Amino acid sequence: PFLDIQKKLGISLDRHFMFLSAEQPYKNAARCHAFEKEWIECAHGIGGTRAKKECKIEFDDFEECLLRYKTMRRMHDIKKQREKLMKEGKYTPPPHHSGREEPRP
Amino acid sequence: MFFINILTLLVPILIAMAFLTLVERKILGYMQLRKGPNIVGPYGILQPFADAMKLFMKEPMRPLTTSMSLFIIAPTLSLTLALSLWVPLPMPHPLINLNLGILFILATSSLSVYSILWSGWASNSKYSLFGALRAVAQTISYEVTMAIILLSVLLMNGSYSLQTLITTQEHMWLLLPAWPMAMMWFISTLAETNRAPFDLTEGESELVSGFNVEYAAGPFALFFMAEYTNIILMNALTTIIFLGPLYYINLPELYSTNFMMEALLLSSTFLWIRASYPRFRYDQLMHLLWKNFLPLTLALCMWHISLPIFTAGVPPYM
Amino acid sequence: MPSTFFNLTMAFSLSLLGTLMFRSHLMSTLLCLEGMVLSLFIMTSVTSLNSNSMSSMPIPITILVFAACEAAVGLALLVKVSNTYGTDYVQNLNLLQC
Amino acid sequence: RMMRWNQERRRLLIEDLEARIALMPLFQAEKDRRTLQILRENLEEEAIIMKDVPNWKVGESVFHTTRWVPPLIGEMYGLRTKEEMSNANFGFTWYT
Amino acid sequence: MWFEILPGLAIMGVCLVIPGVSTAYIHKFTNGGKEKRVARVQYQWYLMERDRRISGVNRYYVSKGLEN
Amino acid sequence: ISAFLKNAWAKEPVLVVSFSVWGLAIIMPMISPYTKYASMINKATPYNYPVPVRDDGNMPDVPSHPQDPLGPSLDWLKNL
Amino acid sequence: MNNYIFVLSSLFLVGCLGLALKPSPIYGGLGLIVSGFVGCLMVLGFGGSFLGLMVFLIYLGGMLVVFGYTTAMATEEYPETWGSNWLILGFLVLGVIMEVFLICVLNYYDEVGVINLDGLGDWLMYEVDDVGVMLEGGIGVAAMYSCATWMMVVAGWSLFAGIFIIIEITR
Amino acid sequence: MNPITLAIIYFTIFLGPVITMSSTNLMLMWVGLEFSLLAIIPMLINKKNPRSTEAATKYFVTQATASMIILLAIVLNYKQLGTWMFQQQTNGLILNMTLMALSMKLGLAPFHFWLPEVTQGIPLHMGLILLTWQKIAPLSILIQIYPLLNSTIILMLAITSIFMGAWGGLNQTQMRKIMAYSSIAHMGWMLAILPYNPSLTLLNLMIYIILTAPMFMALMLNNSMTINSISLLWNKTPAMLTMISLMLLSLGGLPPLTGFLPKWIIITELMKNNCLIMATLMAMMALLNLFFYTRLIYSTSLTMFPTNNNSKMMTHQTKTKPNLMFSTLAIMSTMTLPLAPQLI
Amino acid sequence: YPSKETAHWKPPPWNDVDILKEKAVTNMTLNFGPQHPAAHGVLRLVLELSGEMVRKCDPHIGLLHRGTEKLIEYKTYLQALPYFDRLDYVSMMCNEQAYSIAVEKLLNIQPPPRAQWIRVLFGEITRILNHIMAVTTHALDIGAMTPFFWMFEE
Amino acid sequence: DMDRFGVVFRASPRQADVMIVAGTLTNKMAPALRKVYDQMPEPRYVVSMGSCANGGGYYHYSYSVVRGCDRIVPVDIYVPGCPPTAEALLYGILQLQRKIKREQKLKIWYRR
Amino acid sequence: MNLYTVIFINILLSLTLILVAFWLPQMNLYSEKANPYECGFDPTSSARLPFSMKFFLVAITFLLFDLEIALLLPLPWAIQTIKTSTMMIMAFILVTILSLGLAYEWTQKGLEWTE
Numbered sequence A: 001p002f003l004d005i006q007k008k009l010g011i012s013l014d015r016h017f018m019f020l021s022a023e024q025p026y027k028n029a030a031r032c033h034a035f036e037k038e039w040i041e042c043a044h045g046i047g048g049t050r051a052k053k054e055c056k057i058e059f060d061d062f063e064e065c066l067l068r069y070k071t072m073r074r075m076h077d078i079k080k081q082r083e084k085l086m087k088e089g090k091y092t093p094p095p096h097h098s099g100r101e102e103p104r105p
Numbered sequence B: 001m002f003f004i005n006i007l008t009l010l011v012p013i014l015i016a017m018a019f020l021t022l023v024e025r026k027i028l029g030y031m032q033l034r035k036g037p038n039i040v041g042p043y044g045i046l047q048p049f050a051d052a053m054k055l056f057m058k059e060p061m062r063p064l065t066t067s068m069s070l071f072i073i074a075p076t077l078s079l080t081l082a083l084s085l086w087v088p089l090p091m092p093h094p095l096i097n098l099n100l101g102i103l104f105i106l107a108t109s110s111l112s113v114y115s116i117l118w119s120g121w122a123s124n125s126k127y128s129l130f131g132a133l134r135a136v137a138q139t140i141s142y143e144v145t146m147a148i149i150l151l152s153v154l155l156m157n158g159s160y161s162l163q164t165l166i167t168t169q170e171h172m173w174l175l176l177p178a179w180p181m182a183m184m185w186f187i188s189t190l191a192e193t194n195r196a197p198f199d200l201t202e203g204e205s206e207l208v209s210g211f212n213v214e215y216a217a218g219p220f221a222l223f224f225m226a227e228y229t230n231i232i233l234m235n236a237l238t239t240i241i242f243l244g245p246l247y248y249i250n251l252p253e254l255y256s257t258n259f260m261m262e263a264l265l266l267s268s269t270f271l272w273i274r275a276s277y278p279r280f281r282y283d284q285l286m287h288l289l290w291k292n293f294l295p296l297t298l299a300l301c302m303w304h305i306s307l308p309i310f311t312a313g314v315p316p317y318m
Numbered sequence C: 001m002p003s004t005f006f007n008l009t010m011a012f013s014l015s016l017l018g019t020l021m022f023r024s025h026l027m028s029t030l031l032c033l034e035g036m037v038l039s040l041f042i043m044t045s046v047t048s049l050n051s052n053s054m055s056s057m058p059i060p061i062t063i064l065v066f067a068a069c070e071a072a073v074g075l076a077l078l079v080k081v082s083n084t085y086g087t088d089y090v091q092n093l094n095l096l097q098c
Numbered sequence D: 001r002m003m004r005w006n007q008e009r010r011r012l013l014i015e016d017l018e019a020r021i022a023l024m025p026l027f028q029a030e031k032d033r034r035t036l037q038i039l040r041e042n043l044e045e046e047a048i049i050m051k052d053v054p055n056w057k058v059g060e061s062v063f064h065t066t067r068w069v070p071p072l073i074g075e076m077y078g079l080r081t082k083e084e085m086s087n088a089n090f091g092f093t094w095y096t
Numbered sequence E: 001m002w003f004e005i006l007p008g009l010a011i012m013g014v015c016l017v018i019p020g021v022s023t024a025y026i027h028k029f030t031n032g033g034k035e036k037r038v039a040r041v042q043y044q045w046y047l048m049e050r051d052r053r054i055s056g057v058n059r060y061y062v063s064k065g066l067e068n
Numbered sequence F: 001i002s003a004f005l006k007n008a009w010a011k012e013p014v015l016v017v018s019f020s021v022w023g024l025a026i027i028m029p030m031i032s033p034y035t036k037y038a039s040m041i042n043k044a045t046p047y048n049y050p051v052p053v054r055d056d057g058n059m060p061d062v063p064s065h066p067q068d069p070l071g072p073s074l075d076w077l078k079n080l
Numbered sequence G: 001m002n003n004y005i006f007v008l009s010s011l012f013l014v015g016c017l018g019l020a021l022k023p024s025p026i027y028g029g030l031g032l033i034v035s036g037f038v039g040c041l042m043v044l045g046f047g048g049s050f051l052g053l054m055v056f057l058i059y060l061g062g063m064l065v066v067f068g069y070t071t072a073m074a075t076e077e078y079p080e081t082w083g084s085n086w087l088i089l090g091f092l093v094l095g096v097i098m099e100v101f102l103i104c105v106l107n108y109y110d111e112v113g114v115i116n117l118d119g120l121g122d123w124l125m126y127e128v129d130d131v132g133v134m135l136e137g138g139i140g141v142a143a144m145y146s147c148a149t150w151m152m153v154v155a156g157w158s159l160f161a162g163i164f165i166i167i168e169i170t171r
Numbered sequence H: 001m002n003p004i005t006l007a008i009i010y011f012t013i014f015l016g017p018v019i020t021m022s023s024t025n026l027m028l029m030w031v032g033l034e035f036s037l038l039a040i041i042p043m044l045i046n047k048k049n050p051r052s053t054e055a056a057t058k059y060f061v062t063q064a065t066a067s068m069i070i071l072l073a074i075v076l077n078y079k080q081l082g083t084w085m086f087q088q089q090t091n092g093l094i095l096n097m098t099l100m101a102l103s104m105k106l107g108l109a110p111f112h113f114w115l116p117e118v119t120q121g122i123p124l125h126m127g128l129i130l131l132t133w134q135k136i137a138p139l140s141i142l143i144q145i146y147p148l149l150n151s152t153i154i155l156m157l158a159i160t161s162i163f164m165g166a167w168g169g170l171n172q173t174q175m176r177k178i179m180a181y182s183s184i185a186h187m188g189w190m191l192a193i194l195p196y197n198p199s200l201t202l203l204n205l206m207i208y209i210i211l212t213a214p215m216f217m218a219l220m221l222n223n224s225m226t227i228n229s230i231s232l233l234w235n236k237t238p239a240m241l242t243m244i245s246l247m248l249l250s251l252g253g254l255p256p257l258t259g260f261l262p263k264w265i266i267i268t269e270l271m272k273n274n275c276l277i278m279a280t281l282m283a284m285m286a287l288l289n290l291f292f293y294t295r296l297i298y299s300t301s302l303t304m305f306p307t308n309n310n311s312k313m314m315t316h317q318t319k320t321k322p323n324l325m326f327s328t329l330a331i332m333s334t335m336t337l338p339l340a341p342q343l344i
Numbered sequence I: 001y002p003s004k005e006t007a008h009w010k011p012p013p014w015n016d017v018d019i020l021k022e023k024a025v026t027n028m029t030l031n032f033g034p035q036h037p038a039a040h041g042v043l044r045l046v047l048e049l050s051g052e053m054v055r056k057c058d059p060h061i062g063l064l065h066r067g068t069e070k071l072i073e074y075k076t077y078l079q080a081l082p083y084f085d086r087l088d089y090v091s092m093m094c095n096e097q098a099y100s101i102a103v104e105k106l107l108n109i110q111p112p113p114r115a116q117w118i119r120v121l122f123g124e125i126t127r128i129l130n131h132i133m134a135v136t137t138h139a140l141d142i143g144a145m146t147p148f149f150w151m152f153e154e
Numbered sequence J: 001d002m003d004r005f006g007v008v009f010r011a012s013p014r015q016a017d018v019m020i021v022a023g024t025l026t027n028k029m030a031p032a033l034r035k036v037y038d039q040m041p042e043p044r045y046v047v048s049m050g051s052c053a054n055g056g057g058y059y060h061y062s063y064s065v066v067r068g069c070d071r072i073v074p075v076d077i078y079v080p081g082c083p084p085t086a087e088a089l090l091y092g093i094l095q096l097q098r099k100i101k102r103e104q105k106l107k108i109w110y111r112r
Numbered sequence K: 001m002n003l004y005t006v007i008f009i010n011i012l013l014s015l016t017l018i019l020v021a022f023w024l025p026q027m028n029l030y031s032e033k034a035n036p037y038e039c040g041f042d043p044t045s046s047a048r049l050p051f052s053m054k055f056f057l058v059a060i061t062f063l064l065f066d067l068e069i070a071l072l073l074p075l076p077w078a079i080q081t082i083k084t085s086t087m088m089i090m091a092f093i094l095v096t097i098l099s100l101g102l103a104y105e106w107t108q109k110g111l112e113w114t115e
């Protein structure tokens, strides 16, 4: 920060709930805990300009966990192809996806 | 079968409203050294139906200065909220089991104000607007105390669920721990619902029937039965919270019966109070309910925060 | 979720467009500010519930607190404006140019 | 009296929670193998669906990492019906 | 006289008693000799979804026991 | 000042009760011995799974089983 | 019921749009109330009860004061409803139509990534904890009393000092 | 105002920015900005006249929107990255919206239209605080995120602030607006270099404060608010013309005075990055910033204007107002260039 | 620098206090009319309101003006007596007592002891009538309605 | 007691089914009476009560009196007296009840 | 959907009831019955004019106290934390601060109305 009075005195008024992997009230993990932890543990000691390209894989995995865009694309593609095939009459959905399965437990 | 449940929850409440009107008139009569209705039925058990039918045969008033949209929509909202408030009520097993029932009640009532407050504006007239602003003042007065009272009371229950109060009161009532909170809750239920001595919105001698002076027919009837439904609701809330009846898992109808008894007692108490006292002033109500009730309310909230701790009586989260 | 976040951001933008593009009254501007507050609240709350970040859930209550204090002082200024000019209009406030 | 009663309630709660603790493992095991079953079913269907499109790995990931990333209610229950999708959401939120 | 108020009070009471006993018995009738389940936390919902999927019929209130 | 409080108990007894109850709420937690069992009871509640621990071979005080002698005996919560 | 959340979001957009067109503060407050209701409903749809209930309560208690004020200050002889102005009615209709056309446009230039009409309701809750307890909203807010006690003091100071500010502005 | 209220309000004013500095959460940052907002309005509206009501309403309504926009930026960052800090790999639209709202908070052009109005609508104090202390936290936001800002609008806004402040102060007979346009120009000089060694931004800030505070005191000593009122100073308190002259000629940056150091070193660090013609334009409009200061100091120190008959009463009586800090701040300005390497 | 637009611009005041057309005090007006149940019979009572508190009261009576005095001028002294019963219509016997006393004074005649005694008796009965009336109607207005029904039996 | 019969007052004329002209009607108070009768929503009835309202009464020949509410509102039932005993007004109210009992409206509608 | 159903049922009850109230009866409309009441006589002005409110400060502080309620209301969950001292002190501070503000307003005559 501008005036690191917290680091001066060792207190944490606000710098302990800065992100997701940070002390949820009872120990319930937020989603992308692992991804954010890994990104942050890569980007430590480094600052900025070097972390933005030496810790890019981990940030990209985090971004896909949180915003989760490529899985939307993947399922949308699978669904679109399925609808095309069912319209053409090529695909035949099974019982365990039409609503008739043997429940496991 | 859920729709049959809706029936068994809704139609008897409406008959209860209708006969509460009769009970009000007759109790006020006998307190006033007279007999109320005893003509139209054997002992006047048809006057409510007569009033309803006659009100729905009268021509409604659509004035010229009015805003017809809010005008027609306000009684709708009034009755809808009065009738949705009965939904989570555990008597003992509710129709809709919510985890934040008291917040549902609070928000529903704070929205029920807007029926008065939009009908008064839409009905373009003076006494109408007077009633609306008096409703604003009334709500400003009572809402804070209602919330903090209810907080302090449930601070020994452990949740906002209404059904947990039954187990909180398995061996005792919450009236002996909190009779002061119960007093103030009662008088805030009396300020809510616009019931005497805190009427101050249809104050026939100050205003000429505020927020209903331009309403004649079934709309006015809707406002009427909304009021007389909220009365029974608030008595039901007081007797679920403080006057906890006996659950007895094998005998739940016992809970329902004792609930009936206590709710009737507290409603008759509302009517009694109408008959006994004169009306407050809507600034004297503020002075009362800020300068006497809110200090003691905050002090007793501090007390009820301390009390689970220094007694090792912190309740459970389910 | 992306749909509703888009819609909520467009709602914020509409309320911002509103409070920028003035009309005669000022109360309407204050209400547009309240609407922006509300959309921001819902965005924060939905992000927190999605991510299951119960550590950030104290943020929207703070938003409501400070926004209501903002509304309070705005309404007090409105009381003063009416006591001066009488009619709430923002066109009467045109004497600091000179 | 309230003190003593809430004292007992905080013990009945201990009992209930301890039962929950004792039965967490069975539910966890069954949850695991059920999720894995559903994912294998999705995969065995995606294979026959997208057998024809030019460049498509059927069990491909969206992550550079290799560790277990638990799925979510849309990947799972994606190819399934609308009732299952609308009970995953809106199932607890809309009480029984 | 004051006992001429008890008719209206009686209708009122018979009408206020029904919403409770009716809800209780409807719950017992649909769910079957059982109180309607409360699911205040996700764990209870998990238990009920489980018991649904155990039944063979999509009903959480059959209570399969030690016959399995 | 005793006379002042004597006057205030007659005129304006609502604020006297309020200040009394405020000070009582602040002072009584300092007094009781039961005040400390509250945190202990809130701690005892197992909302989350007690995750087991690997036997390093140097965990004597840690039990090998639920109903062993070791660990925090919750009998202080019984017969409190 | 898969388009539930999208309908709620669209209704909220329309409420805030009719707000931004600025009729008298009566109908503006009506719009605030309806939009806060819708906000509560979607916050519940995403698994949050407390936050929605509190938006509803706060905005109701606020629009009460707005009514009390606008009857005194922001009142005219003719309060200018939405229909009062042909131009406002036209911009309202045009705004609905424009947002509909915009949604149908961005559902084309990107198959998915901003809006998914095709898969709608499939991406709401994102990894619920199917087995859980002591997990609702309210624990996180109650952390204002433990592990986030600076939010509590700073908010309390805002309110406290706001009282003095009110008195001074009004005096 | 009773003392309890003054304690509360000045504590809040002091704690707004202090929370803004000593906070890593952007949301507590926003909280501090809102304390600065809330607590200023009582003392703006203290004298209770239409001018004060208008000033307070304009301030409030302009700052609320900027606050909401900053909160939007923060919430969009939280959605994007699940954190409460503007990292790298954020969206330039978020960062630029933050910059726009912060410029509206400061008073930069083309968001400058409210500052001279508001400043004229309020006393000399509450112009000092508004122009000095309220600028410090909004600047702290930018200083904390300087390697993330786009180096294009950051400079267009600076250039617009320079030009418009110069041109506006060219024709203002009112002094409370001259100070405002000076603020606009100096914030322009700051914001231009803020992506380039932000230590110099704080340098210009400190220099600007040290120049403006004693100038406001000078105006306070006789409640001078006009060229004609400051011109009647060769009779009332004529021992101040020396310091007023040197302070104005430091504000309009002339070399031997330390008010040229910030412009000089800014031009240095801008020519070290091939930002040449922008610096040329800025340096050439600072001259017009100097012109009206020169006109003013003609009017008050070099070409003594007519006075009145009733100004002899002021000569009979005595004064106590110079707080002993006017001297220190006026002499540490105007005479501290040879110590510039220790300032940088 | 004098533009065309800044030509009408006037320099501000020295104390930052502009002279204004102080807004007219447009108090609100209300007919607390005759149908109103608190209007004790017929009473227009135009009153001005700055909210819900009264800045001016102008009672426009004239709604039970018949012309009793002119009709009395046209009637005899006995024919005119029931007008006095009908003037104050909750204290009837006292009004006719006053009229009777006046006509007796004009006649230089006194009534006997028994008549005077029953006259004062019924005068005090009228006092109890009107005091019941006043007290209980005042209470009705204020909100307390049971004294009315308790005392109207008496 | 009137509430025994279902006859309770309401202050607003729009929540009212009947008006009882219990007093003297003056030239200054007649517009108000007619405004009130108008504002009453139909079905609506009028009871003239007392000689001063049936006819002009004891103030028939005066300059400020209308010589009957017949000229301003249509009266359904006339109650005589100065004053009429409340016994008598009650008789007249029950006579108005009997009048309502024989309205035969839907009958004639069917016979249109 | 149970709750949605209950509310729709109540809604439709109210609307059917209003439909009956409007389209069942008979109508005889004319301008002298559809104009505002004002007790027999005519209004001297419109009701859409300023109604000076004399408790506005009380309204604003009610808003702030509403926020205080919103801050106090998480306590039933705050009590099942392990600390039970920080929450105690912080709730004490919040309530005491609110009471101090109420006392300042009271003494400065903010709860009194603007005569």
Ligand SMILES: C/C=C(\C)[C@H](O)[C@H](C)/C=C(C)/C=C\C/C(C)=C/Cc1[nH]c(OC)c(OC)c(=O)c1C
Residues within 6 Å of the ligand: I036, I037, I039, I040, I041, I042, I090, I133, I137, I145, I148, J009
């Ligand atoms: C539960 C029942 C209720 C609340 C009813 O409203 C009450 C019981 C009935 C009333 C009030 C009857 C008649 C109305 C009326 C407006 C009379 C005129 C009047 N009123 C007076 O005083 C009040 C007088 O005072 C001397 C009068 O001279 C005159 C002429």
Ligand code: SF4
Residues within 6 Å of the ligand: I086, I089, J022, J023, J024, J049, J050, J051, J052, J053, J057, J058, J081, J082, J083, J084
């Ligand atoms: S009692 Fe006689 S004088 Fe009085 S109003 Fe009736 S008829 Fe007229």
